[PDB]
């Protein structure tokens, strides 16, 4: 996240940290995700596309730091990894970039609720906030586009939803953005999501609830003028989500 403040997971109790194991001893961060129900985390297909070996990923709930432990955290294995059929990427955008991970603990259980572990709410069929709404994004991704390391502390920031009309302006992303994506930026192009934030959540309040309105997906640069962050429009995938989380 470029800008933003540092937070603790108590302020984002639905955020999940997904890591990959390597033979040699290291586990590296892959992407963020969010918990929808006790056994399901939702993230982005492009985070698993180049290495769809579920047994090699570890999911952690209740984590405020990247490589150190947080008391209360829970570790899970990926029981089912569901990527999106029709996922495609072009020179920038990812289409249908949503993925689901069913988690199982070594004792055979799913997540349990605490002050550091909570689910986030889904929107209702194709229902979104109106452009202008302030939503917050969170994650462990880059702090500057030039960095080559990720922060050790969780970060958060607030961005506003913009319209498709504004995003599809030729000098923004033109037709690369579709009806199944959402764009969010800071009025003064100062804070944004960046590499390392993929799969994490875009939360806004809808009809009273804190709802997962978007998934960090792509963007040209980080916090660049007229280059909003693009998110997967969760409200348009509810059928798909249901199809697997039944």
């Amino acid at each position: 996240i470029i800008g933003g403040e540092f937070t603790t997971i108590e302020n984002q109790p639905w955020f999940a940290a997904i890591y990959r194991r390597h033979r040699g001893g290291s586990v590296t961060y892959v992407c963020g995700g969010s918990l929808m129900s006790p056994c399901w985390v939702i993230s982005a297909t492009h985070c698993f596309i180049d290495y769809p070996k579920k047994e090699d990923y570890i999911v952690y709930l209740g984590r405020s730091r990247l490589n150190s432990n947080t008391q209360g955290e829970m570790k899970f294995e990926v029981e089912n990894l569901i990527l999106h059929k029709d996922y495609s990427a072009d020179t920038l955008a990812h289409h249908n970039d949503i993925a689901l991970l069913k988690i199982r603990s070594k004792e055979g259980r799913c997540a349990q609720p605490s002050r550091t572990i909570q689910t986030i709410c889904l929107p209702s069929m194709y229902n979104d906030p109106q452009f202008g709404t302030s939503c917050e994004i969170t994650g462990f991704g880059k702090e500057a586009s030039t960095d080559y390391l990720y922060p050790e502390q969780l970060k958060m920031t607030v961005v506003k939803l913009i319209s498709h009309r504004e995003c599809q302006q030729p000098h923004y992303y033109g037709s690369e953005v579709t009806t199944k994506m959402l764009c969010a930026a800071d009025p003064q192009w100062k804070t944004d999501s960046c590499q390392g934030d993929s799969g994490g959540p875009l939360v806004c309040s809808l009809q009273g609830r804190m709802t997962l309105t978007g998934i960090v997906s792509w963007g040209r640069g980080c916090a660049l003028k007229d280059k909003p962050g693009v998110y997967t429009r969760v409200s348009h995938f509810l059928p798909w989500i249901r199809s697997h989380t039944k």
């Binding site: 109790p13 006790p38 609720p113 909570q118 689910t119 709410c121």
Partner: peptide, 9 residues
């Protein structure tokens, strides 16, 4: 106690 989506405590 149990999950209540969207609630921070």
């Amino acid at each position: 106690l149990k999950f209540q989506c969207g609630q921070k405590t």
